[PDB]
Structure 1
């Protein structure tokens, strides 16, 4: 009784506005008030799944340092405003929105071409100001989902992303929580005293729902705590590995090599679906195919062999797993 105390629960999701929200957890025995409050504040501020804009491309732009006859703000200000946009997506983990406007007016959020799953949170968010009469802005916006925050240059993966000069890279700053205050107070509970009703107030982007964010943060915290809820000598290092030598290409099919679909159906019609079983396909066992000229054979030799392998090798590792 005096030990093995009770446990809290979420009793209210009172939202004083569309953004400012308040939740009340109760009860907390003692000290758990400040403890849980600070811990949840840290978790919330740190990592909540956001969905801010990450990529844009406009027609007339060649670099974010340009201008565009007709729009009041410069391109860079449009980038900053876009970054300021707040949106939620539900099903997918990324989406490509489109915004087309023409004529004088303040181009705002709601004037984009929303899909069925994407949902703007506040319409009057000003994106730009079309001030010339027959000015036209048509832009595409890749909006993705992630965790935490990431700058622009740190997103570099290859050179094809920057290949289209129209690519503009806004630094994604998605974290639906903007400020998180909390405080405890004496809860006039059923029969006890000094049980602490904790109140958490959150100013957020209207992207995340209060109870949603609370339960997501609680799951994160409970899982990360579970890592040493039964801590031990789990220490990782090991040695003397025996690895399946075959390259993962062999598991993959032909279409995992960027080949012409004609040669794909050709090796279909010549008993080739895997890649570990087309290396078990002699060189005479390829050109017999219905209607191989050189082009389909070009793709074959290119994405099968010329990438490092042969057009059929007498190998004896496959199958080690199939």
Structure 2
């Protein structure tokens, strides 16, 4: 009772952070199981680092107003969440926002540390209103194997770990020769720029494989 295994024929990838990869041919029923399982893992468990918290140099609170910035503090916390952080063996790093002036602070406006990589110099952190303006603060990263909300750090910033911005799988019929109906599984995923999508898939179901390491034998 010999079995049918595909290997991905095409990765059709848009730009860099975006990828759409097709895997064909499958066995009937396998497209949905592979797609769904790989999606559930790709989403809620992926190793990565962003921002769990930042001290406010201006005030003590998430609700306040900064002199020289119209953005509400929660608004800036949002932007901080959208900052791409890939950290090396240093488990928890911390940076500073040091800059001031007549124009917005970007992600290239942050101090440069030893094991820290910002993928986007382009990123908008917050705008700078006129003149001197008091702004510089410090930002501490955090690690997770999954997604941890802001309210969950019990004893505030939403911690976005999983590099995946979006994951979708399209199952369509695949035609092989004398085989009538098969699965053609098309994965489509966007990332935050830290880990590229192509390898992201790989680690994603390597997790799945590792969860299955307690069971099978033979082929290997």
Give the TM-score normalised by the residue count of structure 2: 0.85
Judged with a 3 Å threshold, the aligned counterparts in structure 2 of structure 1 residues 111 and 25 are, in CA distance, closer, same or farther, namely same
Question: Structure 1: 5+ residue runs without aligned partners?
Answer: 158-168, 232-321
* Distance across 2 between alignment mates of 1:88 and 1:135: 30
Contact 1:121 1:206 survives alignment (8 Å): yes
The list of structure 1 runs, each at least 4 consecutive aligned residues, that deviate by more than 6 angstroms after superposition, is none
1:152 maps to: 150
- After TM superposition, give the deviation of residue 20 of structure 1 in Å: 1.9
Judged with a 3 Å threshold, the aligned counterparts in structure 2 of structure 1 residues 230 and 191 are, in CA distance, closer, same or farther, namely closer
In terms of fraction of residues, the more strand-rich structure is: 2
* Distance across 1 between alignment mates of 2:11 and 2:92: 29
1:205 maps to: 192
- The one-character-per-residue Cα deviations of 1:188-225 (angstroms, maximum 9, x if unpaired) are 65885644332101122222222221111211112223
Judged with a 3 Å threshold, the aligned counterparts in structure 2 of structure 1 residues 175 and 222 are, in CA distance, closer, same or farther, namely same
- After TM superposition, give the deviation of residue 103 of structure 1 in Å: 0.6
1:24 maps to: 22
Judged with a 3 Å threshold, the aligned counterparts in structure 2 of structure 1 residues 114 and 187 are, in CA distance, closer, same or farther, namely farther
Identify which of structures 1 and 2 has the higher relative contact order when contacts are C-alpha pairs closer than 8 Å and 6+ apart.
2
- Where 2:52 maps in the other structure, the secondary structure is strand
Of stretches 188-197 and 50-59 in structure 1, the one that deviates more from structure 2 is 188-197
- Where 2:25 maps in the other structure, the secondary structure is strand
Contact 1:100 1:136 survives alignment (8 Å): no
Judged with a 3 Å threshold, the aligned counterparts in structure 2 of structure 1 residues 187 and 116 are, in CA distance, closer, same or farther, namely farther
- After TM superposition, give the deviation of residue 226 of structure 1 in Å: 3.6
- After TM superposition, give the deviation of residue 38 of structure 1 in Å: 1.4
* Distance across 2 between alignment mates of 1:174 and 1:108: 21
In terms of fraction of residues, the more helix-rich structure is: 1
* Distance across 2 between alignment mates of 1:187 and 1:230: 29
Judged with a 3 Å threshold, the aligned counterparts in structure 2 of structure 1 residues 15 and 94 are, in CA distance, closer, same or farther, namely farther
* Distance across 1 between alignment mates of 2:138 and 2:11: 36
* Distance across 2 between alignment mates of 1:13 and 1:122: 24
Count, aligned residues: 219
Contact 1:73 1:129 survives alignment (8 Å): yes
- Where 1:6 maps in the other structure, the secondary structure is coil
Judged with a 3 Å threshold, the aligned counterparts in structure 2 of structure 1 residues 156 and 38 are, in CA distance, closer, same or farther, namely closer
- After TM superposition, give the deviation of residue 64 of structure 1 in Å: 1.9
1:61 maps to: 59
- After TM superposition, give the deviation of residue 133 of structure 1 in Å: 0.2
| Structure whose alpha-carbon radius of gyration is higher | 1
- The one-character-per-residue Cα deviations of 1:139-184 (angstroms, maximum 9, x if unpaired) are 1111122122223353244xxxxxxxxxxx3121322212211123
* Distance across 2 between alignment mates of 1:145 and 1:212: 19
Contact 2:26 2:183 survives alignment (8 Å): yes
Give the TM-score normalised by the residue count of structure 1: 0.60
- After TM superposition, give the deviation of residue 62 of structure 1 in Å: 1.8
Judged with a 3 Å threshold, the aligned counterparts in structure 2 of structure 1 residues 42 and 151 are, in CA distance, closer, same or farther, namely closer
- After TM superposition, give the deviation of residue 58 of structure 1 in Å: 3.5
* Distance across 2 between alignment mates of 1:211 and 1:86: 17
